Amino acid sequence: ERMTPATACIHANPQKDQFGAAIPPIYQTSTFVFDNCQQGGNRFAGQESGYIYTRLGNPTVSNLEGKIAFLEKTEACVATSSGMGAIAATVLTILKAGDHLISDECLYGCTHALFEHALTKFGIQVDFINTAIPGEVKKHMKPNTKIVYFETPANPTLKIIDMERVCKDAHSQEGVLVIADNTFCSPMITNPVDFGVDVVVHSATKYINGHTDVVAGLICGKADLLQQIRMVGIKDITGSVISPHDAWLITRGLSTLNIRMKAESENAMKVAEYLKSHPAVEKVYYPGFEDHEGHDIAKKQMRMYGSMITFILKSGFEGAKKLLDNLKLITLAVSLGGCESLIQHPASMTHAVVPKEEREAAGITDGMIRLSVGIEDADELIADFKQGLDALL
Template identity: 50%
Template sequence: MVAGDEIVADETLYGCTYALLNHGMTKFGVKVTLTDLSDIENLKKNLTDKTRVVYFETPCNPTLKLLDIELIAKTAHAFNPDIRVIVDNTFCTPYLQRPLELGADVVVHSATKYLNGHGDVIAGIVVGKADFISQCRMFGLKDMTGAVLSPFDAFLMARGLKTLDIRMERHCANAQKVAAFFTSHPAVAKVYYPGLDTFPGHEIAAKQMKLPGGMISIELKADRAAVAAALNKLQLCTIAVSLGDAETLVEHPATMTHSTYSAEELAAAGISEGLVRISVGLEDPEDIIDDFKTVLDTL
């Protein structure tokens, strides 16, 4: 991309991605437009002859908002076939969702998360058609950005991939049970999980995801201080900004992954002080539920 080019991205993004787009790319003269891509009309009205990239996550971090990959890709390519549709597939992995088969041009993963699955590697992956990947290699981008794993990290990634299917099946099964528990607890105002029939976008999940995933977000009926105090009482689950590990990881987006957002930006992204994101692990689901029940009963 060069100065004057434009990116259209969904308004709900991982905090560091948001920072890169809004505080990084803009300094190089690239215009970034954030909009709600769950309404396809928002994409149509923001595409211009300078648009080079349409970027989004699905499910989105941390609200689990679901976006129709096929519809977005078709709309962008109908406007201009040269637009690159880039999808962050970290929450799903290729086991649950395959954006390239739905029309996306490029898929990115934080391989630190589910692909590795054990919380002991920092890595990322870019997947795309051969011509695009060849361009990245030709211009030395993989070297300039430090995107080369050490041999040992590569070994750990290969180890994790051997159990990806088994782990994702367990993550999803556990998450379904934990989400059902949250829907019945009086301290929980709202549950965000694609596997719930009541969740907006449930139909999209059924269409493009093999299973609903292992990520849940919940809205607690409490202020920031009460939420922090409650989370600190967890015994089995761990407070951490990462996700996709064998252990259940819990975080408070407003003060952790999305702490650089202004109050206005948090509100626009649907991130309240009561929102808690949970990466459901591989433990016995009843143990996870018991840990949360003990904590939520104090609210």
């Protein structure tokens, strides 16, 4: 029986330090000494194991990578210095001028901009579609289609996508890679490779680190493709090299990932249910609600329903600013997945970079408020909302 996820966030990929250090040391070194020239030339040629230089690989970073690969059930993992770097190192390794990419239209704002404006200036063709509609992916495929990409639940509407149905369509022609951004679930909730996904990416800045003090990304997938991503996407094209110090903080944060995800999902269900019945609140989105579109798909793909909640007030945008400015426990900031509860307004903040018309076509409204529930006491979270919401009348 496979080591459980609970035990594995601490003990997968055990390290062997020469002194028996309980916590493996931090390899804050840019470079590694060769014993002789032959060894150096063998490593550079890929003929001998061992380290060379921190943009190419680092033992502290590998420690984190093997733990994550295990938790995602993939052969390998490549760590980067930001979720965007993980995304970009992946798609810029795979694609070239002439290729085609299909993406869900509801994405993190910066990923949407990368696909709409950067890839298209490098000669890559992109389609933005609703990949939650059965059959939509297959309808937009062309012979040169190389990647189908999506986020579920989506940032920030929490739209659910049936991953297995998307993979069926994408893999109905040879040579297509399906990439899922699994940031909002984390590996404790979902393992996208279960459903046919080829590559899984994360902003490790969010739940995996969980402590709001590290910006970093992760790429999980087959070893041969990830070796290409490492030697092309990381080494030359993005240069998104994580600091070994930051990787060591993420391994530290990872050790409480299982207890954090459970506590945050439990609190989120209580908070979502509270929000739903407040008279000032118009609509609440939470994957665990039975009336949430794709709830049955969500239950199939997610072990817990997450700590992300998106909601709309009956007083709209102006209502959203008043509530948000008057919260006393919940913190006003972007990002998510930390131990403290955060909240923000996607149309003027995380998704302001996406043109309104594209926002709204994807279901992102100007009234939406996006909340990431931490591990505070749930009654005190509810009480902060009550006081803030009662003031709206």
